[PDB]
Design a protein around this ligand. Structure first.
Ligand SMILES: NCCc1ccc(O)c(O)c1
Length: 376
């Protein structure tokens, strides 16, 4: 009965991304900024290598329970605060707790589900938690902020975090410190690998595309089409639905089509969709490209996590904390400098030129995935 561990990392990923998206609508209205948004991803980027090394010394359960303790503290602090410095502290602590949760949970999943096919099948479900969290965050925050009050969403999130922590105490039971049997191959050796670098680069560019697309699209919309506020929110919904669908189906479907081919087609499709986005004239023209973008990115992610796990087992020692720290660093890098660089480029040159450059880069990087195919 290892489904409980899958349930733990599903809930930790779900609740963490629920808090990530509930806070974004509330903070600007309550306060009145770029540093605060990027503080979570920057701090999480820095602590990823240290969590990767710490799991090899003491194991996964203590870092996981510690992640819940940091997330619980961050949630209560957000609800009770009202100052900018405390907001920075809380978001930075979430960045630390999210790093712990992501790295330790992914390593524990890779260490519990050792089979190659089952690993991808369960990582699809686990990555579905992120998509569900981003899907249900904003409406949850909106309703509890509308009716009950400002602190109600945070208090309900804290209650769910307490429930999650109690389940963790019952199942994980972080009572003693247990070191891993073998050393894990230091980060310097792994960063010299060209195949790990190719997989990380594909993840980084695919996610950096959407990282720039998401905040830069409403500004172009409100000037080109003069769209209503409700449309600005419901226009990106196809991407979030298609991400869930594609992640959950391609977790199983990528092993038969071939992980390299699924990643290659994902990069090609996301590049073509990003290239066609500037040609749209209204929301109905934007429905299809966003669906394509979400589908392709789900393809890339659900094909590229188990490939990272496979690469460490194929030519290095089977210890997953450091390599999944590398993968998390790849994700955070796109989400840290994404919005600011995107805004700078879209101010220097047009939004269509930014979209064209992103699409061209993705299409040109796409053939690099050919080297990821297995020798036999
Ligand atoms: N790696 C997750 C990429 C992603 C998918 C859907 C989203 O809505 C989003 O903001 C980000």
């Amino acid at each position: 009965s290892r489904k409980l561990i899958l349930f733990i990392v599903f809930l930790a990923l779900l609740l963490d991304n629920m808090l990530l998206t509930v806070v974004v609508p509330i903070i600007p209205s309550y306060l009145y900024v770029g540093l605060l948004f990027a503080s979570k991803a920057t701090v999480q980027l820095i602590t990823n290598p240290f969590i990767g090394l710490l799991t090899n010394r003491i194991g996964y359960p203590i870092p996981i329970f510690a992640g819940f303790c940091i997330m619980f503290v961050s949630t209560i602090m957000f609800a009770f605060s009202s100052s900018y410095a405390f907001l920075l502290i809380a978001r930075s602590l979430q960045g630390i707790g999210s790093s712990c949760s992501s790295v330790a949970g992914m390593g524990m999943l890779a260490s519990v589900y050792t089979d190659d096919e089952e690993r991808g099948n369960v990582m699809g479900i686990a990555l579905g938690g992120l998509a569900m969290g981003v899907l249900v965050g904003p409406p949850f925050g909106s309703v509890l902020y509308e009716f009950v009050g400002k602190t109600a969403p945070f208090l309900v999130l804290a209650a769910l975090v307490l429930l999650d922590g109690a389940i963790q105490l019952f199942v994980l039971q972080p009572s003693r410190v247990q070191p891993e049997s073998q050393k894990g191959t230091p980060l310097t050796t792994l960063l010299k690998d060209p195949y790990i670098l190719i997989a990380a680069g594909s993840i980084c560019f695919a996610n950096m595309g959407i990282a720039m697309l998401e905040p830069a699209l409403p500004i172009w919309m409100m000037e080109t089409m003069c769209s209503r506020k409700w449309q600005l929110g419901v226009a990106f919904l196809p991407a979030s639905i298609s991400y869930l669908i594609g992640t959950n189906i391609f977790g199983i479907l990528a092993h038969k089509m071939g992980r390299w081919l699924c990643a290659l087609l994902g990069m090609i499709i996301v590049g073509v969709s990003i290239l066609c986005i500037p040609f749209a004239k209204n929301i109905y023209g934007l429905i299809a490209p966003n669906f394509g973008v979400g589908f392709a990115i789900g393809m890339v992610d659900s094909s590229m996590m188990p490939i990272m796990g496979y690469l460490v087992d194929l030519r290095h020692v089977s210890v997953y904390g450091s390599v999944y720290a590398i993968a998390d660093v790849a994700f955070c890098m796109g989400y840290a400098i994404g919005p600011s660089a995107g805004g700078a480029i879209a101010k220097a040159i047009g939004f269509p030129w930014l979209m064209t450059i992103i699409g061209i880069i993705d299409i040109l990087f796409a053939p690099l995935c050919f080297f990821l195919r297995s020798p036999p």
